[PDB]
Amino acid sequence: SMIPDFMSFTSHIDELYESAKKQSGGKVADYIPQLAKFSPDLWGVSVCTVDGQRHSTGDTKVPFCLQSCVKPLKYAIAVNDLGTEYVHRYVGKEPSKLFLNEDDKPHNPMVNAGAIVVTSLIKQGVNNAEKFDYVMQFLNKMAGNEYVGFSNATFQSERESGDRNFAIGYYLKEKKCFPEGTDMVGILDFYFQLCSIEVTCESASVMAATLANGGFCPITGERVLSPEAVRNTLSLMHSCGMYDFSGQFAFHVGLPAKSGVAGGILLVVPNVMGMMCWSPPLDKMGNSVKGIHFCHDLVSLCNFHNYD
Amino acid sequence: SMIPDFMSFTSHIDELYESAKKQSGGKVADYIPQLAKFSPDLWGVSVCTVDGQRHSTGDTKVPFCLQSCVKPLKYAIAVNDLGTEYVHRYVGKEPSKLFLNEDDKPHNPMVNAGAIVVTSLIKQGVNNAEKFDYVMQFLNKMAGNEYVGFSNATFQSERESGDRNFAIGYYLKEKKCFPEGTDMVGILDFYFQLCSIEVTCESASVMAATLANGGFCPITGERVLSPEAVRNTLSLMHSCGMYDFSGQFAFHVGLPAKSGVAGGILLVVPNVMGMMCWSPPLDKMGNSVKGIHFCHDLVSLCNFHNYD
Amino acid sequence: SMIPDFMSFTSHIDELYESAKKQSGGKVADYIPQLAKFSPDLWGVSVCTVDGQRHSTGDTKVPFCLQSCVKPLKYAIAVNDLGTEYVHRYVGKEPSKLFLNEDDKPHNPMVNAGAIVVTSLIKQGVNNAEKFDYVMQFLNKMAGNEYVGFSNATFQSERESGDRNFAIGYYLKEKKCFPEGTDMVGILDFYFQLCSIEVTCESASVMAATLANGGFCPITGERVLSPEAVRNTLSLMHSCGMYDFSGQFAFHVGLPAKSGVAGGILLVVPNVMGMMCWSPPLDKMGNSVKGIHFCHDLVSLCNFHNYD
Amino acid sequence: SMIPDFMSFTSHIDELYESAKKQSGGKVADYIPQLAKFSPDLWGVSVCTVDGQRHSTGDTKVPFCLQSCVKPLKYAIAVNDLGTEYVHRYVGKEPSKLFLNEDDKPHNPMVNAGAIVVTSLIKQGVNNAEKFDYVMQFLNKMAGNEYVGFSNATFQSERESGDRNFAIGYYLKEKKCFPEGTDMVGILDFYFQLCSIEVTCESASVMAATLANGGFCPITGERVLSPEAVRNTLSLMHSCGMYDFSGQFAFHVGLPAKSGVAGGILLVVPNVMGMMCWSPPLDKMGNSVKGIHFCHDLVSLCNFHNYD
Ligand SMILES: O=C(Cc1ccccc1)Nc1nnc([C@H]2CCC[C@H](c3nnc(NC(=O)Cc4ccccc4)s3)C2)s1
Ligand SMILES: O=C(Cc1ccccc1)Nc1nnc([C@H]2CCC[C@H](c3nnc(NC(=O)Cc4ccccc4)s3)C2)s1
């Protein structure tokens, strides 16, 4: 452990939060109205160390949708229940516009085509209502029963306007990427629902902290995810987590992270802490402008980089 | 005109038909059962000169589906009713796996994504029943009322299994390639129906002959297609007509042609004649093995190449 | 023949020349100084029918370099001496940034990598001085001994600055695209020299006219090129001749043409005439802005399109 | 530190070495004779912890060429002398056939085009003899003066046959990727020389160990590389180090590594140890078959993965 005094670390979290606050650039997502509603000035950072110690600053109790931040989490669930070898019969492990790599598999679980296929592996045979409860049970344990809600509003707007996800769905059905007997449209329904699950910075930072803690929820001690599943999820967050910025993020920050279109950035410092940054304004790559800035400052200050 | 005596030309058509007959290679399409039914040994060649003179050899009265051979024809209809400039707001004009070129348009009207968009331009506002009748009225005039039927069997099997066409449909809806207010699924329905229209070599060769005759049906004299529409259709048949073989076909044969998965090859010798070759066995590119062979022999014998 | 009275056709050539003259757009090539010297306002059009009848307007006696306009011509020479089958062991026949197609061959003889390989097939074993004389002997016959000169200035500037052509040369040597025992650097030298041969609109239009005349020089009657070689050259000019505009040129104009960076456009109306348009200002695609305009107007006026 | 007793760790190194030894697959590189000479059965593993403790098994004193294993090392030198910001004006930082990414920069310092450009940044103005001495001085310090030799044989064979590297060189000169005033051919000469530097497993493992030790040579204590330079080098080894296997190596092994065509694998366990595995037989990706196997077994046994 490299935190010595947790109290003066939060003092530095605060100053970093404040530096990020001045970065007004970006553009709140507006392709469904449930994302355009949100205020550019919303900005919250929540820490949960592997100890269970906590600290928030700013808008950490306002709920927003995980969106793509749920991709690592359901990937972790699928590996937990099924193991590396099974899951990656169906999805790549590399960061390579296009839907399918050279082997007719989605490139990785962090791109839509990947997460769609990952969704079709969780808890098969059962209908969508118990599928969603099963994953929800899992998400709660990762957050130690803190806020995990649901936005029916974005679910309907994402289903009704996600023609690209439907194109993905049919293409994957064509090139035979699902387990046989998969209702593809039902799987998309599940996908949209998972994308519409809601968290706060405070509850998400606890989810990231169980990933930071080999699968053990730091505020309940409970074993949630297998060590295998956490190792996999972190590797792919390290390399595929930030859209087309995953490359420069691995180089300059080098921590497992996964951003979403609601402006969350699920950040993991392994064996140290979990975090969730949130500011709805996104840069041209699709990442929280305040989050990106903050993540740079955090590493250039406390030397948290993978190789420091 | 370079046919002198039509009687001894048919004698040479016969010998060519016979040479092609010995080419047993290929593999009948079998992705729906309505195509696997068909007999490898079926082989027919039908000529209809710009005079109206006719000649068939072999299985020229057995009906088969146009499939992709309908792509030039509905493209011709759309240009006829709407002109070059309107149509190619929506679809490319070049032979460039991928659905959309660099300008987010289907590459050309001879690839599925192109023909789907072309379908969405014909006779808009009207419902699908009158759309289909309108195109059917048109197809009859191009064939001088000879056989134009319909295979409800392949329509249902093509709709129920064409997940790639649905993926295309949703992607084009995402990247906004349809005229606004287009029911995309209804357009796919129309697309599948047009692909399921049936002809015989004898009726198709008459369709190709109106294309060979600046839009005038050689056996009714009636003006069917505008000169613009015929010129466009022939250019794109010359360059995009034979799947991934269009390149080598333009080089070595250099005549407007359009093949389909039922093993038809709709061939046009401009200001000379129309033809329809048919043999259900396809080569690795998707073209009638006997048709390809025959088309080579026809040009290397009567010097019909574009530049001879 | 569709020219009736040659005298009133030239009257229409004149009016078209005049319409093109008002199109001041473009940008004279300036990557070597031997091209930046040239005056934007230079504009000449030279016709030579298959009869031998001639007509020029404007700057038709000012010499400029063929540059890429020599690509069809040396391709014609190679097929003449070696036949389709041999030549296309080494170079593609299709219009597919990249140097080599999927079969590790240059896409076609009209892209640099293609023309470089074509150059390595002409008159092998002999040294470069007799190679150049042999091709020069050939170029003279195609022009009926009219102006064929040489710009030593551009040869040296093209050799000294053509690092992309050298990169091409080494890559083709790596992927083994030359006949064995080929001095690759010597072949580039030959390539640069051929690109630096000089013509006038008046002499070039005679070269294009032998291509328009199945290989027979219309003003000497002499057989210059085999019918095979002319047919091949014209097909590839039809489809690969205008850089990234070859597609839209085949659709909208549909005549064999080949442009070069000096602003020439070598145009062929088969069995009718040869032409050479020249205006050093190029559009963003690399084609003579006045030439492109003129070529459109010529077809939309005298209905010379391939399929009209 | 997670090694407790170094003595029983070497006992496990031995058993792993022995397991790898049974893997006879692969194919010794044979594109120059200086690589075909080598014996398939050569197999050595050398460890050098951050303590300075050492252990070898097998052919650890037989010299071989670094080849691409020198790419991280000269990248480290360039960042050391010039800093992140300068170096990556000229070369990418991501793992994206093709020479240049979308910004006309080599994708990363671990692909030839990258390492060539990196070579052109080291110690500019000086001639090649002092350039090579400067890098050699540096390589010695990283190895604590242990074996660093030179194979003039492979230098000449690599220069005389490396047409692909020359094609790279000219293309980079065309797209202006070098600092101005760079003699490109001289830079290739330098590149070939650096690729021909020789090490043994025992001396290389010491080089990897200074990378494992924030830039401090564990057996001389001397500061060799800046912390910046080591952090960068390790990130790019983690993601770009194993040719087209870097992806699956990051997922399944997750340690900075860099392989070469002589069958070396320069392995780094950060803050633990350096290693050099060597077995000339390569798999289809270009990696030491025994090394790949060994690297898997090492992580699945001592839980050395980045995220374990
Ligand atoms: O974006 C553009 C713009 C553009 C134009 C020109 C060049 C590049 C890009 N134009 C596209 N239009 N439609 C596309 C995809 C959409 C998803 C579904 C389809 C596919 N998705 N993935 C695929 N993968 C493979 O086939 C395997 C493979 C491909 C490439 C290299 C190696 C292996 S096909 C087509 S992209
Ligand atoms: O322009 C760019 C920028 C860029 C951005 C985005 C996407 C592509 C490209 N970057 C380049 N980097 N290098 C280039 C030259 C020099 C090295 C060799 C390159 C090639 N020459 N021939 C090739 N063909 C094949 O490998 C086989 C094949 C692959 C895929 C499809 C069909 C055939 S690749 C061309 S351009």
Residue numbers in the entry:
A (entry chain A), B (entry chain A), C (entry chain A), D (entry chain A): 219 to 314, 320 to 531
Paste lines from the article.
Glutaminase is a mitochondrial enzyme that catalyzes the first step in glutamine-dependent anaplerosis by converting glutamine to glutamate, more simply referred to as glutaminolysis. GLS1 has two full-length splice variants, kidney-type glutaminase (KGA) and glutaminase-C (GAC), whereas GLS2 encodes liver-type glutaminase (LGA). Others and we have reported that BPTES inhibits KGA by binding to an allosteric site between a pair of homodimers, and this results in a dramatic conformational change in key loop residues (Glu312-Pro329) that render the tetramer inactive. Additionally, we determined the crystal structures of the cKGA (catalytic domain Ile221-Leu533 of KGA) in complex with the trans-CBTBP enantiomer (1S, 3S-CBTBP), and CB-839.
Trans-CBTBP is structurally similar to BPTES, with the exception of a 1,3-di-substituted cyclohexyl ring in place of the acyclic aliphatic linker on BPTES. A racemic mixture of trans-CBTBP enantiomers: 1S, 3S and 1R, 3R were used for co-crystallization with cKGA. The cKGA: 1S, 3S-CBTBP was found to crystallize and the structure was determined at 2.74 Å resolution. This indicated a higher preference of the 1S, 3S stereoisomer for cKGA over the 1R, 3R form. BPTES and 1S, 3S-CBTBP share similar symmetric halves, and have identical hydrogen bonding interactions with cKGA. The interaction of 1S, 3S-CBTBP with the cKGA allosteric pocket is primarily mediated by hydrogen bonding interactions from the thiadiazol group and hydrophobic interactions from the cyclohexane linker. Unlike BPTES, the cyclohexane linker of 1S, 3S-CBTBP improves the hydrophobic interactions and imposes rigidity across the center of the inhibitor.
